[PDB]
């Protein structure tokens, strides 16, 4: 269709304003081609010319499916812009029109509507909730209502999955509770599909849903997806592991019962790998996830011990991206505040002291508080054993004292005060 290549906006207005349906189609296609060029589509020039209302209008032309598709694609690309550009589409009444197109007999047109609705809901809470109020969920879910997902076109299924994930996205406020319940069963089904992109996006959706109040985590865990998530956690593809780890990590921020679900699922066996993972970010979120587990019950802190994960924490505390090291500090402080004397002793035997002292030289008052704090916990445990002195030496040996004393003259009241106490109570 070489005729509709690189038209001027004024020519496009000319064709759309003509009273010829075919002319309108050619002009709409040309607009779509401008909006689809590899670099900088003239989204604002198109909006300024007042073309949105026309395009939205062509969405309803059941008798001319070709113009439905062209305007649907044009509107989609406009909607992929800034909030203001996305708003211009919503303002034109595109939401209900796109929902009606979801039932189109033409797969490519229905898919376009799915894409567009995905861009609209992806702008944030307000438009997401507006899409939901217009009743987009039923039609969307109905498109996946087939015996076997594998008979659906791959590109088509990735699109639906992605759009559903956006309906599950954002937090202030979180998606409507009944909307999440409606979507979850399908999300669970997509989580078992064989396509890597479907899996990744499904995990992201589950990660958005588990990112909030423990009641939200509950409705997700209630579906029994933790085992599948743990499995996806051991996936070869980084794009699947990242979202899986996020979901698992969010779940352990909940109650001890919910945390126990991932432990029972066998998640801890994967961490030796995650804690030494080549990507700093997988390594950081893994340590963060570990920190919320050591913040659990002692029987849970023991499972962390039994899987031999303390040594991995010592390693991350010893050498890692600083952010990860900071998450390691927390994991340790949590372990020491809730652990038994035996578990805290074990932590020391694994060699946690030296790497913990070296991190006292970090320019970050918060981590410094967290560390010093952990030290206090450990001494406290050594006191109940009359071995407070053996601990002091050890801290001296590696140069911990020569740093706790220096912090004693820090400018943060939390720090120096915490320092003083230690020195004047243990050194």
């Amino acid at each position: 269709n070489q005729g509709t290549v690189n038209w001027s906006v004024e020519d496009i207005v000319k064709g759309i304003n003509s009273n010829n349906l075919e002319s309108q189609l050619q002009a709409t296609q040309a607009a779509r081609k401008l909006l689809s060029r590899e670099k900088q589509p003239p989204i604002d020039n198109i909006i300024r010319a007042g073309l949105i209302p026309k395009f939205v209008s062509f969405l309803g032309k059941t008798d001319c499916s070709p113009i439905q598709f062209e305007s649907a694609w044009a509107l989609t690309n406009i909607a992929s812009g800034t909030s203001e550009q996305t708003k211009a589409v919503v303002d034109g009444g595109a939401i209900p029109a796109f929902i009606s197109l979801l039932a189109s007999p033409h797969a490519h047109i229905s898919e376009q509507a799915v894409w567009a609705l995905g861009n609209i809901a992806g702008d944030g809470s307000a438009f997401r909730d507006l899409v939901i109020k217009h009743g987009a969920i039923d039609p969307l879910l109905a498109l996946l209502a087939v015996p076997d997902l594998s008979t659906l076109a791959c590109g088509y299924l990735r699109n639906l999955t992605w759009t559903l994930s956006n309906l599950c996205r954002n937090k202030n406020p979180a998606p409507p509770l009944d909307a999440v319940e409606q979507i979850l069963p399908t999300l669970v089904r997509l989580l078992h599909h064989n396509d890597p992109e479907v899996l990744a996006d499904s995990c992201w959706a589950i990660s958005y849903l588990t990112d909030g109040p423990n009641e939200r985590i509950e409705m997700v865990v209630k579906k029994g997806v933790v085992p599948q998530l743990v499995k996806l956690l051991g996936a070869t593809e980084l794009p699947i592991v990242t979202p899986a780890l996020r979901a698992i990590g969010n779940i352990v921020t909940g109650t001890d019962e919910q945390t126990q679900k991932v432990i029972d699922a066998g998640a801890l066996a994967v961490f030796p790998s995650l804690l030494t993972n080549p990507k700093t970010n997988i390594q950081k979120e893994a340590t963060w996830t570990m920190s919320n587990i050591t913040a659990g019950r002692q029987d849970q802190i023991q499972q962390v011990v039994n899987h031999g994960l303390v040594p991995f924490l010592v390693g991350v505390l010893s050498k890692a991206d600083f952010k990860t090291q900071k998450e390691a500090a927390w994991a340790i402080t949590n372990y020491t505040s809730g652990g038994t004397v035996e578990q805290i002793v074990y932590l020391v035997h694994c060699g946690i002291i030296e790497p913990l002292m070296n991190l006292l030289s970090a320019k970050d008052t918060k981590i410094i508080q967290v560390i010093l704090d952990a030290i206090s916990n450990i001494f406290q445990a050594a006191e109940k054993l009359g071995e407070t002195e053996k601990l002091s030496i050890m801290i001296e040996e590696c140069g911990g004292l020569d740093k706790i004393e220096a912090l004693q003259r820090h400018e943060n009241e939390s720090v120096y005060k915490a320092s003083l106490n230690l020195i004047e109570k243990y050194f």
Partner: peptide, 11 residues
Amino acid sequence: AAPPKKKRKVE
């Protein structure tokens, strides 16, 4: 990083 919030249909 997480999936794009929006996507432009290229070409």
